[PDB]
Design a protein around this nucleic acid. Structure first.
Lengths: 96, 85, 134, 428
RNA sequence: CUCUUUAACAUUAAGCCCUGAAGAAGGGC
């Protein structure tokens, strides 16, 4: 039933990302599913613009991370578990 | 420089009355909370993990099932009250 | 360089393993079976996946004597790359200490957040005593 | 013995599920029976009864409570009658060996029947309470299905349900069916015919757990949060601290340029949030919870702990905030009453504090010259405390340490005794 | 072919006006 799940991940703060990814692995492990992740890509630079009060005549880029995982086979409990966990805030985990 | 608080503007307007009352009294007071008001109970929730919770969700299926069983069997004692006609 | 560029891809695999904690045969078969990286060479990529053996754990112990912070308190993302670096340091010793180690600080430029490599540029004093041919 | 056929059919019909305990049924209904037999007999007695699942017949034994005293001669013994038991009985243990006449009736059936269904009610409620104990204080997501007036019913999976009272939800926000709601449950008040879970977004536990999901440092138990106070629509104050001194807790909760706290504030409806350090000194911790506005003068009354605060005007208006709730949050966080004023009014307020009381001293023992001087260090001790503090402290080079202190204590204690006597039998 | 052991700084606002010292209560639009 739509077994080829596709998951990517944006990661503004690595600390939350390692734990989050580890939880996404533990939910598949506990249901019985096994899969390969996170496969981290190098740090991506996202230029930042800021607008502080006018300085006399202000960050402009902060580090980001990215990960990707699939699923070999979602058990009926694995979809309710994947939807059941609460994604850590501040990180965009939009499913591919 | 909005300072858009009507009551504050009134405070500046009625500042002289405030001065008339300023002498020999408590100026402002602020009490909050209570023991019964401030129980928070936040000692330990890590044993419940988001994996454990997502893996063991709140299930009350057996309760509703059992309930339907009871109601059916009670209708069956009303069948004991029932006569064939 | 392009062959050196292969190494980082191998570097990426173990983190997978490190968090999946599965049999390495599954990791290799599924990894290469999904896609082939035409740039990197499996001829060398496959040899490092064997290095999952705990000899590299013995070498990572070498970082414990001097450690301002706890052994595993530091990011496992950043600990993996140290297990790789010292894998090549003692088991392989292919690149000299300062040459491999400068590149190494660049390596944790690539994935380490907040100058993680830059401060860990102190830690290279711990690597020097293993080989006095500096 | 006896066994109402109807009641046996009832206990085999409402027979407890495998998860449930069938034995409990008998434990209850035998208490019911024995209580009925007890009500039959003219003298007040203690009685028991037992049934086996195999047969259904029961046996009723009237028993006495072995004790070392004379109260209730209808239910008491000595170890001498326990010699029939071969001394095996001990005091505080109630045993005997004589059966009593087992009662049979019809009206009992009804009330017996009642207990059965009665237990079932408790069985439902209790069976639900388990799940609550399993998830007590944790955030769970549900999908609204009803919208009653000022409270909404939420569906959870596996036939589980919940409800949010309007006080528990955001002041601004009204919800609609089909909307996913993240919410920590916090109580299970027993409604008639079983209870149902209560959830809340307004309570501080929503915010604290909302931080637990966001800051793993708390999840790793590295840092503790000592208290949290919040105004749901507007702003919140939270006190954090770590004794390790290894990392900064406020920095850990704030994140990158606030991105870790703002996120939760986004979930909290953009609620403003002040994260402050937790401190064990009350006064200093008060100043830390008084922020963003801060003062340099603090006065405490640990007898009432209704401490007072004074401040410049420009920082005064910031200290009170809108409707005062700023201080109201600080106090709410501190768990202690507060008080704010202007410094100019503060100094004079202390001089008045001392002046009226010194007029009382001058009203009692009348040496205004000697009392105003003693008043200078009286501030630590009320007129009763001077008599209550050990005499070891008030001895100084000023005044007379030995001849005058005794008389002083006599005067003060006699006067306060006069007030205590004036409390009762006064004119009005 | 060294950079000397891993960021945290976050809040932009809730009308006008009256009785009342009040930032307690309470009101008219």
């Amino acid at each position: 039933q739509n077994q080829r799940i596709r998951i990517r991940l944006k990661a503004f703060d690595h600390r939350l990302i390692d734990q989050a990814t580890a939880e996404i692995v533990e939910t598949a492990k506990r249901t019985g599913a096994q899969v390969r992740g996170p496969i981290p890509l190098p740090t991506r630079k996202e230029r930042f613009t800021v607008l502080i009060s006018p300085h006399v005549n202000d960050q402009y880029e902060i580090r980001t991370h990215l990960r990707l995982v699939d699923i070999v086979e979602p058990t009926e409990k694995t979809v309710d578990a994947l939807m059941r966990l609460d994604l850590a805030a501040g990180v965009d985990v939009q499913i591919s | 420089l909005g300072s858009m608080d009507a009551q504050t503007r009134r405070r500046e307007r009625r500042a002289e009355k405030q001065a008339q009352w300023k002498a020999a009294n408590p100026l402002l007071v602020g009490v909050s909370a209570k023991p019964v008001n401030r129980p928070i109970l936040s000692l330990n929730r890590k044993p419940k993990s988001r994996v454990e919770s997502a893996l063991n969700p709140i299930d009350l299926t057996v309760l509703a099932e059992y309930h339907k069983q009871i109601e059916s069997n009670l209708q069956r004692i009303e069948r004991k009250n029932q006569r064939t006609w | 360089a392009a062959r050196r560029r292969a190494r980082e891809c191998a570097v990426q695999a173990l983190y997978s393993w490190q968090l999946s904690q599965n049999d390495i045969a599954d990791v290799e078969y599924q990894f290469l079976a999904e896609q082939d990286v035409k740039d990197v060479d499996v001829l060398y990529f496959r040899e490092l996946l064997a290095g999952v053996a705990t000899n590299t754990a013995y070498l990572d112990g070498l970082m414990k004597p001097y450690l301002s912070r706890l052994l595993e308190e530091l990011g496992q993302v950043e600990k993996a790359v140290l297990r790789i670096a010292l894998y090549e340091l003692s088991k392989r010793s292919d690149v000299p200490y300062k040459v491999a180690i400068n590149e190494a600080i660049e390596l944790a430029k690539s994935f380490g957040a907040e100058d993680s490599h830059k401060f860990v540029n102190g830690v290279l004093d711990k690597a020097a005593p293993v080989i006095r041919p500096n | 013995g006896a066994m109402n056929k109807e009641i046996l059919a009832v206990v085999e019909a409402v027979s407890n599920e495998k998860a449930l305990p069938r034995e409990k049924i008998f434990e209850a209904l035998e208490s019911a029976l024995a209580t009925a037999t007890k009500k039959k007999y003219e003298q007040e007695i203690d009685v028991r009864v037992q049934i086996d699942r195999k047969s259904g017949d029961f046996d009723t034994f009237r028993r006495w409570l072995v004790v070392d005293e004379v109260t209730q001669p209808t239910k008491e013994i000595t170890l001498e009658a326990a010699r029939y038991e071969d001394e095996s009985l001990n005091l505080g243990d109630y045993v005997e060996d004589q059966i009593e006449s087992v009662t049979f009736d019809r009206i009992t059936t009804q009330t017996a029947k009642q207990v059965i269904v009665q237990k079932v009610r408790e069985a439902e409620r209790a069976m639900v309470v388990d799940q609550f104990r399993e998830h007590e204080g944790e955030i769970i997501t549900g999908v609204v299905k009803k919208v009653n007036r000022d409270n909404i019913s939420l569906d959870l999976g596996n036939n589980a349900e919940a409800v949010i009272l309007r006080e528990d939800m955001l002041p601004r926000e009204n919800f609609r069916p089909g909307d996913r709601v993240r919410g920590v449950l916090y109580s299970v008040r027993p409604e008639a015919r079983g209870a149902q879970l209560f959830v809340t977004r307004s309570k501080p536990e929503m915010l604290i757990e909302l931080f637990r999901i966001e800051v793993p440092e708390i999840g790793e138990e590295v840092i503790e949060i000592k208290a949290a106070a919040r105004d749901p629509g507007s702003r919140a104050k939270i006190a954090v601290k770590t004794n390790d001194k290894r990392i900064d807790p406020v920095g850990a909760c704030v994140g990158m340029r606030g991105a870790r706290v703002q996120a939760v504030s986004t979930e909290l409806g953009g609620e403003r949030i002040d994260i402050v350090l937790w401190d064990d000194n009350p006064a200093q911790f008060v100043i830390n919870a008084m922020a963003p506005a801060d003062v340099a003068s603090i006065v405490v009354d640990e007898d009432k702990h209704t401490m007072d605060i004074a401040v410049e005007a420009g920082n005064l208006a910031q200290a009170i905030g809108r409707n005062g709730q700023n201080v109201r949050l600080a106090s709410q966080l501190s768990g202690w009453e507060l008080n704010v004023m202007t410094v100019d009014d503060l100094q004079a307020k202390h001089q008045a504090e001392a002046h009226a009381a010194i007029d009382t001293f001058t009203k009692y023992l009348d040496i205004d010259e000697d009392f105003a001087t003693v008043l200078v260090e009286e501030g630590f001790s009320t007129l009763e405390e001077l008599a209550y503090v050990p005499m070891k402290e008030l001895l100084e080079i000023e005044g007379l340490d030995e001849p005058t202190v005794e008389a002083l204590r006599e005067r003060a204690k006699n006067a306060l005794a006069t007030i205590a006597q004036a409390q009762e039998e006064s004119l009005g």
